[PDB]
Amino acid sequence: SARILVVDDIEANVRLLEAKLTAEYYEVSTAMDGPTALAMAARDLPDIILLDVMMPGMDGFTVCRKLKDDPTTRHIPVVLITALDGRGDRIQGLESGASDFLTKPIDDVMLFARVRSLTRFKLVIDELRQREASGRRMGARLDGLGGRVLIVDDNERQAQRVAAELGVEHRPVIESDPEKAKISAGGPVDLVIVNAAAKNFDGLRFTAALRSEERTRQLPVLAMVDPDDRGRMVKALEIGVNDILSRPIDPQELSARVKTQIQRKRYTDYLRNNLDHSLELAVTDQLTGLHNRRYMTGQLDSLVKRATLGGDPVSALLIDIDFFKKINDTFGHDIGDEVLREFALRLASNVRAIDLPCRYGGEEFVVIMPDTALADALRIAERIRMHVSGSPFTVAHGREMLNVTISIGVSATAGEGDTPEALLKRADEGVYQAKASGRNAVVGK
Amino acid sequence: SARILVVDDIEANVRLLEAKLTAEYYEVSTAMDGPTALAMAARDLPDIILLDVMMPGMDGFTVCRKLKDDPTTRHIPVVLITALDGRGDRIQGLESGASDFLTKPIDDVMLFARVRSLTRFKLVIDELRQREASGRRMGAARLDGLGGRVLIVDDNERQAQRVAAELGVEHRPVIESDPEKAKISAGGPVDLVIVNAAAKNFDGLRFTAALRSEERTRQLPVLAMVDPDDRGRMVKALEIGVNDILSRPIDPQELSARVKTQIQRKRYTDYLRNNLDHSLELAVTDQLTGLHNRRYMTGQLDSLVKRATLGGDPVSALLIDIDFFKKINDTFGHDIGDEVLREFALRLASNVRAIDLPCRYGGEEFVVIMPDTALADALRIAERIRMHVSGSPFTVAHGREMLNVTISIGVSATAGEGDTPEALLKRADEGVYQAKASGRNAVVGKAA
Numbered sequence: 001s002a003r004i005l006v007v008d009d010i011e012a013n014v015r016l017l018e019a020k021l022t023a024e025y026y027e028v029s030t031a032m033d034g035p036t037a038l039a040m041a042a043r044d045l046p047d048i049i050l051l052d053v054m055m056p057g058m059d060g061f062t063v064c065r066k067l068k069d070d071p072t073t074r075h076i077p078v079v080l081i082t083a084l085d086g087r088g089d090r091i092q093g094l095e096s097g098a099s100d101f102l103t104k105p106i107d108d109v110m111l112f113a114r115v116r117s118l119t120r121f122k123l124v125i126d127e128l129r130q131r132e133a134s135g136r137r138m139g140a141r142l143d144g145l146g147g148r149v150l151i152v153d154d155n156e157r158q159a160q161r162v163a164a165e166l167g168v169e170h171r172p173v174i175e176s177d178p179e180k181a182k183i184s185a186g187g188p189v190d191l192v193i194v195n196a197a198a199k200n201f202d203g204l205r206f207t208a209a210l211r212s213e214e215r216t217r218q219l220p221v222l223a224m225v226d227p228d229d230r231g232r233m234v235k236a237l238e239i240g241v242n243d244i245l246s247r248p249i250d251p252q253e254l255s256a257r258v259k260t261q262i263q264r265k266r267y268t269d270y271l272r273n274n275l276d277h278s279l280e281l282a283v284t285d286q287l288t289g290l291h292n293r294r295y296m297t298g299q300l301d302s303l304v305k306r307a308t309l310g311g312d313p314v315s316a317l318l319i320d321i322d323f324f325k326k327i328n329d330t331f332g333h334d335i336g337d338e339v340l341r342e343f344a345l346r347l348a349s350n351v352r353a354i355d356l357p358c359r360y361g362g363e364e365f366v367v368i369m370p371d372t373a374l375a376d377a378l379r380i381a382e383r384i385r386m387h388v389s390g391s392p393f394t395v396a397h398g399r400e401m402l403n404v405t406i407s408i409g410v411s412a413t414a415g416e417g418d419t420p421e422a423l424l425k426r427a428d429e430g431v432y433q434a435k436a437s438g439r440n441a442v443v444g445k
Numbered sequence: 446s447a448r449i450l451v452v453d454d455i456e457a458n459v460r461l462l463e464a465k466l467t468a469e470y471y472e473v474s475t476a477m478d479g480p481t482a483l484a485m486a487a488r489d490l491p492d493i494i495l496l497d498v499m500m501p502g503m504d505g506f507t508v509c510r511k512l513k514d515d516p517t518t519r520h521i522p523v524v525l526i527t528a529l530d531g532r533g534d535r536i537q538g539l540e541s542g543a544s545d546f547l548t549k550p551i552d553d554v555m556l557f558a559r560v561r562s563l564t565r566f567k568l569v570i571d572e573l574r575q576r577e578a579s580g581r582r583m584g585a586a587r588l589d590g591l592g593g594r595v596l597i598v599d600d601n602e603r604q605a606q607r608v609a610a611e612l613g614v615e616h617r618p619v620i621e622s623d624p625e626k627a628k629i630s631a632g633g634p635v636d637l638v639i640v641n642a643a644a645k646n647f648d649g650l651r652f653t654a655a656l657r658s659e660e661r662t663r664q665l666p667v668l669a670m671v672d673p674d675d676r677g678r679m680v681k682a683l684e685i686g687v688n689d690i691l692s693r694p695i696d697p698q699e700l701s702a703r704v705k706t707q708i709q710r711k712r713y714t715d716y717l718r719n720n721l722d723h724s725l726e727l728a729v730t731d732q733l734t735g736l737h738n739r740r741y742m743t744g745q746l747d748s749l750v751k752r753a754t755l756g757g758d759p760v761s762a763l764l765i766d767i768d769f770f771k772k773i774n775d776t777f778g779h780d781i782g783d784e785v786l787r788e789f790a791l792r793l794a795s796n797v798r799a800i801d802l803p804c805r806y807g808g809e810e811f812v813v814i815m816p817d818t819a820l821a822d823a824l825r826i827a828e829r830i831r832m833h834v835s836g837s838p839f840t841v842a843h844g845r846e847m848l849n850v851t852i853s854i855g856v857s858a859t860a861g862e863g864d865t866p867e868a869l870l871k872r873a874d875e876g877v878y879q880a881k882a883s884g885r886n887a888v889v890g891k892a893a
C-alpha cells in the first residue's frame with residue numbers, strides 16, 4: 001500500500017515500471033511531464049518518487065530541485081534514474097537533492113532494493129512528522145552525516161578508497177578481521193559496509209551473524225556486491241542487508257546510500273529510545289500494569305470503524321470505584337495504590353484477554369470488549385461487580401482488610417456511524433446515573 | 446549464530462540436516478541417542494532442538510518430556526520430526542510439549558521457515574528470562590499462547606469454518622471474507638491473522654503485503670495457508686513477511702502449534718517493549734538532559750574496550766563534573782538547576798563528535814566516551830569543552846536569569862591488553878578528584 005510516483009516522458013518506460021511495481025503490490029501513479037509530476041506530487045503526497053533525468057522540456061534535475069523546494073514534498077524520497085556513465089548525472093542529482101539513484105538498464109533486484117529501503121525510511125519519516133506535530137502542543141542530530149562507518153573488507157585498496165570517499169562527510173574505520181569487526185560492530189557503529197565478494201571471509205556469513213544477535217540485529221548494513229553474481233546479490237538482500245552497492249563503488253551512490261541508512265537509524269533511535277520512553281507517549285500504566293487511555297483510543301477507533309461497516313458490535317464498560325477518597329483518607333495513599341493494583345488484577349482475570357482492560361482515569365477503569373452485545377456486556381458488568389464487591393481486598397501486608405464497591409456504565413457500538421467518543425460518552429452517562437441511583441450498581445445506556 | 450541441536454538415530458539424516466543448516470549460517474550440534482541429546486541440551490543450552498520422534502530406546506516423545514521437566518531446558522523450543530502418517534505422532538508430541546513439527550521427507554522451505562520463527566521466539570524468550578533474573582536481584586498479563594483473537598481471512602467457507610472450529614476451543618476466532626473489512630479489523634486488537642494465500646476472490650499475499658506496508662500492522666503476526674504444490678507462492682509469502690506457513694489441508698495439531706508460537710511471541714514482545722522497556726530501571730536515555738545514561742555507556746564501553754585490548758586505536762574517556770552545583774540549587778532552585786543541566790547537555794553534545802558518546806554518568810556528572818582517540822587529543826578536546834562551558838553563560842528562568850558554570854574534567858585512555866572499562870573510568874575519576882583539589886576549572890589526565 002506504498003504509493004509510488006513514476007515520472008518519465010516515454011510512455012513505454014513508465015508503463016513497464018508501473019507493471020513491475022504493481023506486480024510487487026505497490027500503488028503506482030504515473031506522470032509524463034515535469035510540471036504534471038510536481039502538481040500530482042503536491043496533490044497525492046506520495047511515499048516515493050521515481051524520476052528520470054532525461055526528460056525534454058523540464059529535466060529531471062529541475063523537477064527534483066522543485067520537489068525539494070516545496071515544503072509539502074521535501075520529505076518525500078526521490079530516486080533519480082540515470083544512464084550508464086552517469087557519474088555527471090549522479091553528481092548533478094546529489095546537487096539537486098536526490099535521495100538515491102538507479103542506473104539504466106533497470107535491474108529489478110536493485111530497483112526493489114531501493115524501493116524497499118526508502119519505503120522503510122518513509123515510514124520512519126512520517127512517524128516523526130506526526131509526533132512532532134503532537135509534541136508542539138506539548139502532548140538531536142537527525143541528518144545523515146558525521147557517522148561512524150565500519151568497512152569490513154580484506155581488499156586494502158577498496159577499503160582505502162571507500163574510507164576516502166566517506167572521509168569528509170563521515171567518520172570511517174576499516175577492519176579486516178571478521179571477529180574484531182564483530183566486536184566493534186557491537187559498539188558505537190552507525191553503519192557497516194561489508195564486501196560480499198571477500199575472499200578471506202564470507203561477508204554474508206558475517207552479516208547473518210550480525211542479524212542473529214539482538215545487539216546487532218538492527219544495525220544498518222550495506223553490502224558491496226559484484227554485478228556479475230546476481231545470486232549473492234539476492235542472497236545478501238535475504239540474509240538481511242538494507243541495500244546493496246555495485247562494484248566498482250561509485251562515490252555518489254555510496255554517499256546517497258550511507259546518508260539514507262544513517263538518517264533512518266537516527267530517526268528510529270530518536271523515536272524509540274527517546275520519544276517512546278516519554279511520559280506522555282506511554283501506553284502502559286506503571287502502577288496498575290494495565291494499558292492507558294492512549295492505547296484504548298487507537299484500538300477503539302479501529303474497532304468502532306469495523307462495527308460501522310457492519311457486523312458484531314464493540315461494547316464498553318466504565319467502572320468507577322465508590323468512595324475511593326475515603327480509602328485514601330483512612331489508610332493512606334499507598335494502601336489506595338495497593339487497592340488499585342489488586343482491582344486491576346481482579347478485573348483482568350475476570351475479563352477475556354481479547355478484551356482491553358485499561359485504566360481510564362485515576363480511580364476509573366475501562367473494559368473494551370470486542371464483538372460483544374449490550375445485553376451480554378451488562379451481564380459481564382454484573383459478573384465483575386459481584387467479583388469485586390464480594391471478596392474483600394487485603395492490604396497492609398495482611399494487617400487490614402477493606403471492602404470495595406464499584407459503579408459501572410455499559411455502552412455498545414450498536415448501529416452504523418457510531419464513534420469511539422459517543423460510546424465512551426454513553427458509558428459515562430451510565431456511571432453518573434449509577435452513582436446517583438445509590439451505588440454498587442450497573443447502568444446501561 | 447543461533448545454536449541448533451539435531452537429534453536422530455540415523456547418522457545420514459543427522460549429517461544431511463547439519464549440512465543444510467550450517468549452509469544457512471547456523472551453528473549445529475548433533476546427537477544420535479536420547480541420553481546424549483539430553484546431556485548436551487542441559488550443557489550447551491541450545492536455541493532450538495530438532496528431534497526425531499522415531500528413535501530406538503528412548504523415543505523422541507520421551508526426550509521431549511524430559512526436556513520439559515528439566516527447568517534448565519524447558520524454555521528451549523523443540524521441533525519434532527515426524528513421518529507422513531503422523532496424526533498420532535503429532536497429538537502425542539503436543540502432549541509431550543513440542544513447539545512445532547516437521548514432516549519427513551524434509552522440505553527445505555518448511556525447515557528454514559520453522560527455524561526462523563522459533564529462533565525469533567527464542568530471542569524474545571532469552572530477553573524475558575534476563576529481565577526476570579534482574580528483577581529477582583532487584584527485588585500481571587497473559588504470557589501463554591492461548592486465548593487470543595485470531596482473524597481468519599478466507600473466502601473458502603468450509604476451510605474457514607474448520608479452522609475457526611479447531612481454534613474455537615483454545616482461542617477466540619473471527620472470520621472475515623472481505624479483505625478491506627479484514628484490513629480494518631487487523632488494525633485493531635488482533636493477535637494473529639490467518640490468511641489463505643490460495644484465496645479465490647482476493648490475493649492473500651497482496652493483503653499480507655498491505656498489512657506489512659502500514660506501520661500499525663507491520664509487525665502483526667501472520668500465518669498463511671499455502672498449497673504444498675505451489676512452492677513459488679510459499680516462498681513469496683515468506684518474503685513479503687509472513688511469519689510461518691501452513692500446508693493445505695490444514696492439520697489441527699500443526700495449526701494449534703503455530704498459532705500458539707505466534708501468539709506467545711507477540712505477548713512476550715509486547716510485555717518487553719510496552720511495559721518493561723518503559724520501566725525506569727531499563728531506560729537508556731535520560732529524560733531531563735535527553736542524553737544517554739550510564740547503562741547505555743556501560744554496554745558500548747564494554748565493546749569498545751574489548752576491541753582496544755585486542756589491539757588497535759585506543760578509546761578515551763572524559764568525566765566532567767560541574768563545580769559548585771549545590772550553590773546553584775541553593776540560590777535558584779532545583780528547577781533552574783535542571784535547566785542548567787539540560788543546556789549543559791546540549792553544549793556538550795554540540796562540541797564533541799556524534800561518533801562520541803556524551804552521556805549522563807551521575808546527577809551533575811557527565812561522561813564523554815570518545816572512540817578511536819589518544820590521550821593527548823582527548824586532553825585538548827577536554828580543554829575545548831572547558832572553554833565552551835566557562836566562556837558563555839547559561840540563560841535560565843525563561844531569560845530572567847543568567848549564570849556562569851565551571852567544570853572539572855578527568856581524562857583517561859585505554860592502555861594495554863588487560864585494561865577494563867572499570868579501570869578506565871576509575872582513572873578518569875582520580876583525574877576529577879585531583880582537578881577538584883587543584884582549584885577548579887581544570888583538566889587532569891591519568892594514565893595507568
Ligand SMILES: Nc1nc2c(ncn2[C@@H]2O[C@@H]3COP(=O)(O)O[C@H]4[C@@H](O)[C@H](n5cnc6c(=O)[nH]c(N)nc65)O[C@@H]4COP(=O)(O)O[C@H]3[C@H]2O)c(=O)[nH]1
Nearest residue numbers: 350351352353354355368369370371372373376377379380
Ligand atoms: N468480549 C467478551 N465477551 C463475553 C465475555 N463474557 C461473556 N461474553 C459474551 O457474552 C456471550 C454469552 O456468554 P455466557 O452467557 O456467559 O455463556 C458463555 C459461557 O458460559 C461460555 N464461555 C466462553 N468463554 C468462557 C470463559 O472464558 N470462561 C467461562 N467460565 N465460560 C466461557 O460459553 C458461553 C458462550 O460464550 P460466547 O459464545 O463466546 O458468547 C458470550 C460472549 O460473546 C467476556 O469476558 N469478554
Ligand SMILES: Nc1nc2c(ncn2[C@@H]2O[C@@H]3COP(=O)(O)O[C@H]4[C@@H](O)[C@H](n5cnc6c(=O)[nH]c(N)nc65)O[C@@H]4COP(=O)(O)O[C@H]3[C@H]2O)c(=O)[nH]1
Nearest residue numbers: 349350351352353354383591592612613614615616617618
Ligand atoms: N461466565 C463467563 N466468564 C467468562 C467468559 N469469557 C471470559 N470469562 C471470564 O474471564 C476469565 C478469563 O477468560 P480468558 O482470559 O479468555 O481465558 C480463559 C479461556 O482462554 C479458557 N476457556 C474456558 N471456556 C472457554 C471457551 O469456551 N472458549 C475459548 N475460546 N476459551 C475458554 O479458559 C481461560 C480461563 O477461563 P476462566 O477460568 O473461566 O476465567 C475467565 C472467566 O472467568 C464467558 O463467556 N462467560
Ligand SMILES: Nc1nc2c(ncn2[C@@H]2O[C@@H]3COP(=O)(O)O[C@H]4[C@@H](O)[C@H](n5cnc6c(=O)[nH]c(N)nc65)O[C@@H]4COP(=O)(O)O[C@H]3[C@H]2O)c(=O)[nH]1
Nearest residue numbers: 796797798799800801814815816817818819822823825826
Ligand atoms: N573521538 C573524537 N576525536 C577528536 C575530536 N576532536 C578532535 N579529535 C581527535 O583529535 C585529532 C586532531 O584534531 P584537531 O587537532 O582539532 O585538527 C582536526 C580538525 O581541525 C579537523 N576536523 C575534523 N573534524 C572536524 C569537525 O567536526 N569540526 C571542525 N571545526 N574541525 C574538524 O580536522 C583535524 C584532524 O582531525 P582528525 O584527522 O580526524 O584527528 C583528530 C581526532 O582524532 C572529537 O570531538 N571526538
Ligand SMILES: Nc1nc2c(ncn2[C@@H]2O[C@@H]3COP(=O)(O)O[C@H]4[C@@H](O)[C@H](n5cnc6c(=O)[nH]c(N)nc65)O[C@@H]4COP(=O)(O)O[C@H]3[C@H]2O)c(=O)[nH]1
Nearest residue numbers: 145146147166167168169170171795796797798799800829
Ligand atoms: N567526516 C568529517 N566531518 C566533518 C569534518 N569537519 C566538520 N565536519 C562535520 O560537520 C559537523 C559540524 O562541525 P562543527 O560545526 O565544526 O562543530 C563540531 C566541532 O566544534 C567539534 N569537533 C568535532 N571534531 C573536531 C576536531 O577534530 N577538532 C576540533 N577543534 N573540533 C571538533 O565538535 C562539533 C561537532 O562535530 P560532529 O558532531 O562530528 O558534526 C560536524 C562533522 O560531522 C571533517 O573533517 N570530517
Ligand SMILES: Nc1nc2c(ncn2[C@@H]2O[C@H](COP(=O)(O)OP(=O)(O)OP(=O)(O)O)[C@@H](OP(=O)(O)OP(=O)(O)O)[C@H]2O)c(=O)[nH]1
Nearest residue numbers: 321322323324325326328329333334335336337362363435
Ligand atoms: N491512592 C491513589 N488514589 C488516586 C490515584 N489517582 C486518582 N486517585 C484517587 O481517586 C480520587 C478521585 O476519584 P473520585 O471519583 O473523586 O473518588 P470517589 O470518592 O470514589 O468519588 P465517588 O463519589 O465514588 O464518585 C482522588 O482524589 P484525591 O486525590 O483528592 O484523594 P487523595 O489525594 O487523598 O489520595 C484520589 O483519591 C492514584 O494514583 N493513587
Ligand SMILES: Nc1nc2c(ncn2[C@@H]2O[C@H](COP(=O)(O)OP(=O)(O)OP(=O)(O)O)[C@@H](OP(=O)(O)OP(=O)(O)O)[C@H]2O)c(=O)[nH]1
Nearest residue numbers: 766767768769770771772774778779780782783808809881
Ligand atoms: N537541580 C538538580 N540537581 C541535581 C540533579 N541531579 C543531581 N543534582 C545535584 O547535583 C549535586 C551533586 O553535586 P556534587 O557532586 O555533590 O558536587 P558540587 O557541590 O555541586 O560541586 P563540587 O564539584 O563538589 O565543587 C547534588 O546536590 P545534593 O545531593 O546536595 O542535593 P541538592 O541538589 O538538593 O542540593 C545533587 O542533588 C538534578 O537532576 N536536578
Ligand SMILES: [Mg+2]
Nearest residue numbers: 320321322323
Ligand atoms: Mg469515585
Ligand SMILES: [Mg+2]
Nearest residue numbers: 766767768769
Ligand atoms: Mg560538583
